[PDB]
Amino acid sequence: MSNQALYEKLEQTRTILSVKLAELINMTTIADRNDDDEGSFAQENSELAVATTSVMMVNNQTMQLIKNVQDLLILTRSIKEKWLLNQIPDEKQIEELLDNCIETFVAEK
Amino acid sequence: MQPPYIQERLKSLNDIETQLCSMLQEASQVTFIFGELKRGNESVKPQFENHVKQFYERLDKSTTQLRKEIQLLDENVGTNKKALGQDTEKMEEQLDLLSAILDPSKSK
Amino acid sequence: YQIKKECALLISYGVSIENENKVIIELPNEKFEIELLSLDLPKINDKRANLMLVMLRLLLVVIFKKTLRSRISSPHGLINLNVDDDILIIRPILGKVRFANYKLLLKKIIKDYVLDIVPGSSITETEVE
Amino acid sequence: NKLSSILQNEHDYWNKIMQSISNKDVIFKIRDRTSGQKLLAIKYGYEDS
Amino acid sequence: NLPLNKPRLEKLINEILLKSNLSLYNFLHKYVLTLQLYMVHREFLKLANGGKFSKSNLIHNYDSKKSTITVRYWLNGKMDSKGKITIGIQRTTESLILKWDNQSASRAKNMPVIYNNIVSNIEGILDEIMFNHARIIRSELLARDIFQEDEENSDVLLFQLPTTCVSMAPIQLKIDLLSGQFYFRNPTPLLSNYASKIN
Amino acid sequence: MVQQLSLFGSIGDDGYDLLISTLTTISGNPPLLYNSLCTVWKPNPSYDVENVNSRNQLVEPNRIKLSKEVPFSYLIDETMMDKPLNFRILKSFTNDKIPLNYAMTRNILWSLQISDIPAAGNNRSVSMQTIAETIILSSAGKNSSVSSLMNGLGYVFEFQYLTIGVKFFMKHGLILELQKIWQIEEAGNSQITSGGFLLKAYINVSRGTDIDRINYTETALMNLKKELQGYIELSVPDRQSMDSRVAHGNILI
């Protein structure tokens, strides 16, 4: 129920943050790094597969961002729909009125 | 019309998705600016910090407000009915019509 | 529908059904036609017909209120309306009209056979609840 | 750009829906016999009266 | 405009012709008659819900194996007769016909018992049968010379009754066109009781 | 004589108002106020009933219930005529004190009723109880009074209590009751159902031999219980608590 939606939005937000940081680092060091020291770990062994992995990153970040935003919007609409649907919430004068009506009909009939 | 509480609830929700749209738009401008920043002109460098900060602060408080709404759902629990009176009101209006029929000076 | 089911039992007194949308009531001096019609000079009795429609609607509302009261009163009672008892729509109006006709006829008879024959007779009219 | 254009379009329809609907009334969701999707329905008969 | 199964019909007719020694025409005629009978039954079902004869006036039973419809009318009628109608395929003409199974209709002259074009004017045929049965009963009553003939109305029977010692007046009795119970114009409680006894 | 098929439960007054609304959302009917007064009578211990067949146990002594309706003019104090007579008055009935005291009930002194312990076995989903009932219409004589009548039969007074609550009529003859019970003594009045309402949903069957009807009744009761899942838990009470024979003393309240 609502707690499950809370948790789902939680991984939604953390996934946004993580993929944001990932695309940031990927595009910033998209310029390949060559360092003589053994400490650095950046490998570009096969030339064109580097571009393939780059477009990999592009497609992944696009799909994930769009899907997460769309899911959040659908979640908001579902909440609003639940809001709309689920929230469960003289005689005497008539006497002379009918008397005049019936006498008028009797006279007119 | 609906009771007011639902009205400000829907206003807050509408603000929520408008904020989400603003976040997407600002993501578009930050992606745009990073391209020319990689190109090599440093004039728009100061704008980058402002755009990033506004993007993050737009991402955070929107989710916070939505969290507040979902929390409101938690304590809002416990807080044809019209048919039970429907015939009655129909009754009333019919007699009103008879009154208009009964008085010939009001049929103008 | 209620008018149809009610008037199906009044054939013996001069009430007939023409088609699925028309019913006819005959009186020694008058005729009434009730029709259900699709949309596809002020006369004397137009107000009369409007009043008839109004009281028919009022009687239907009264029937609904009686049904609801009977339902609320007790759960066991099966709510199956009786045509002879529950459905009272044309009965009051027809009774009023025919009672007025018979009252006029008896007034005439008394005047001819008593008032015209025996002078000085005093007549007083009363209604008893 | 595509997402912004489309998305603002459905906010346009969304606001039209929100400010076009009035209210007590028995409202629910039903599955259409022909379409099979969920649509809003209102009970207006005298069945409960 | 009927949604015919064209390919299944193609294979069926091809198989029949391959196995044929005539048979295709017989099958087509049988299917046409069955479809006409089924749509007549469907029209009866549609009419019975809201028709003038809904209140036990007409009952119809349909048999597909014999492809015949039996119609019973005037259940509350015991005047040495039972209103029965049979709709079925005529042997001589291979056509669906309606027969009013009644001995009174059997010896009745200048009055057709078998009718066609049931689909177009089933209501007219039923009304004609109703009026003919009422007229036959009325003619039998006149032959017994219990009720005198009404010149103004051919469907109204006059019964002579003395209202007082010297008065000798006629009373108008009429026949219901739907269920067929005799009724008076302005029956008294005794008159209503004896009308019910007559029924 | 009926076979009554019943299910029980209880609720705290805090949710009371909310509960009421939900019921009207389901049944489509509004609640109706009611009250009653029950007096329990037991066989006189001064008389030795040797006729109880000890070697065969043909029968055991039991307790008789006499019920009557009391007008609200005895239950409304001087502070309450301003409010209309509807269900909301129950919201003010939370104190152990009540306008009807011991002296008025003594001045009063109907429906006579006897029951048996529910049917044994653990394959029963609803409480099935047998009830034998009759009605007293009037009386006369030199000592025409309920007390004198029950002493003539051979019974004496044991205690009494007062029920106030609301009723809901649903389809298929199902009756749902929300009750508050006040025990009454010369020492004073004490509300046993303190800070809550007792909920009881039941149906009546006229003939115990008909089993199709009993199966239908059980189906309706279990469907009703499965409708209220998550809000209130309706349960079968203890079979040994609804036993009203004189030999052993306990009272489901």
Curated annotation (Swiss-Prot), chain A:
One GO CC term, this protein: core mediator complex
Extent of the signal sequence: none
Effect of N86K: In SRB6-1; suppresses the phenotypic defects of an RNA polymerase II CTD truncation
Keywords from the UniProt entry: Acetylation, Activator, Nucleus, Transcription, Transcription regulation
Gene3D superfamilies listed in its UniProt record: Mediator of RNA polymerase II transcription subunit 22
Major location category of this protein: nucleus
Pfam hit, one: Med22
GO terms for MF: transcription coregulator activity
Protein's GO biological process: positive regulation of transcription by RNA polymerase II; positive regulation of transcription elongation by RNA polymerase II; positive regulation of transcription initiation by RNA polymerase II; RNA polymerase II preinitiation complex assembly
N-acetylserine modified-residue sites: S2
Subcellular compartments: Nucleus
Domain of life: Eukaryota
Other known facts: Present with 2181 molecules/cell in log phase SD medium.
Function of the molecule: Component of the Mediator complex, a coactivator involved in the regulated transcription of nearly all RNA polymerase II-dependent genes. Mediator functions as a bridge to convey information from gene-specific regulatory proteins to the basal RNA polymerase II transcription machinery. The Mediator complex, having a compact conformation in its free form, is recruited to promoters by direct interactions with regulatory proteins and serves for the assembly of a functional preinitiation complex with RNA polymerase II and the general transcription factors.
Protein family: Belongs to the Mediator complex subunit 22 family.
Chain's gene name: SRB6
UniProtKB/Swiss-Prot annotation, chain D:
Stretches assigned to coiled coil: none
Localisation: Nucleus
Family according to the record: Belongs to the Mediator complex subunit 17 family.
Record function comment: Component of the Mediator complex, a coactivator involved in the regulated transcription of nearly all RNA polymerase II-dependent genes. Mediator functions as a bridge to convey information from gene-specific regulatory proteins to the basal RNA polymerase II transcription machinery. The Mediator complex, having a compact conformation in its free form, is recruited to promoters by direct interactions with regulatory proteins and serves for the assembly of a functional preinitiation complex with RNA polymerase II and the general transcription factors.
Note: Present with 1720 molecules/cell in log phase SD medium.
Protein name stated in the entry: Mediator of RNA polymerase II transcription subunit 17
Gene name as annotated: SRB4
Residues of the full protein shown: 296 to 344 of 687
Swiss-Prot record, chain E:
Locations listed in the record: Nucleus
Leader sequence residues: none
Record family assignment: Belongs to the Mediator complex subunit 14 family.
Quaternary context: Component of the Mediator complex, which is composed of at least 21 subunits that form three structurally distinct submodules. The Mediator head module contains MED6, MED8, MED11, SRB4/MED17, SRB5/MED18, ROX3/MED19, SRB2/MED20 and SRB6/MED22, the middle module contains MED1, MED4, NUT1/MED5, MED7, CSE2/MED9, NUT2/MED10, SRB7/MED21 and SOH1/MED31, and the tail module contains MED2, PGD1/MED3, RGR1/MED14, GAL11/MED15 and SIN4/MED16. The head and the middle modules interact directly with RNA polymerase II, whereas the elongated tail module interacts with gene-specific regulatory proteins.
Miscellaneous note of the record: Present with 319 molecules/cell in log phase SD medium.
UniProt name for this protein: Mediator of RNA polymerase II transcription subunit 14
Organism: Saccharomyces cerevisiae (strain ATCC 204508 / S288c) (Baker's yeast)
Lineage, highest ranks first: Eukaryota, Fungi, Dikarya, Ascomycota, Saccharomycotina
UniProtKB/Swiss-Prot annotation, chain F:
Gene Ontology process terms (BP): cellular response to heat; positive regulation of transcription by RNA polymerase II; positive regulation of transcription elongation by RNA polymerase II; positive regulation of transcription initiation by RNA polymerase II; RNA polymerase II preinitiation complex assembly; termination of RNA polymerase II transcription; transcription open complex formation at RNA polymerase II promoter
Top-rank taxon, per record: Eukaryota
Gene Ontology MF, one: transcription coactivator activity
Gene3D superfamilies assigned to the protein according to its UniProt record, in alphabetical order: Hypothetical Protein Pfu-838710-001
GO cellular component: core mediator complex; mediator complex; nucleus
Keyword hit for Methyltransferase: no
Coiled coil: none
Keyword field: Activator, Nucleus, Transcription, Transcription regulation
Localisation: Nucleus
Chief subcellular location: nucleus
Family: Belongs to the Mediator complex subunit 18 family.
Function: Component of the Mediator complex, a coactivator involved in the regulated transcription of nearly all RNA polymerase II-dependent genes. Mediator functions as a bridge to convey information from gene-specific regulatory proteins to the basal RNA polymerase II transcription machinery. The Mediator complex, having a compact conformation in its free form, is recruited to promoters by direct interactions with regulatory proteins and serves for the assembly of a functional preinitiation complex with RNA polymerase II and the general transcription factors.
Gene that this sequence comes from: SRB5
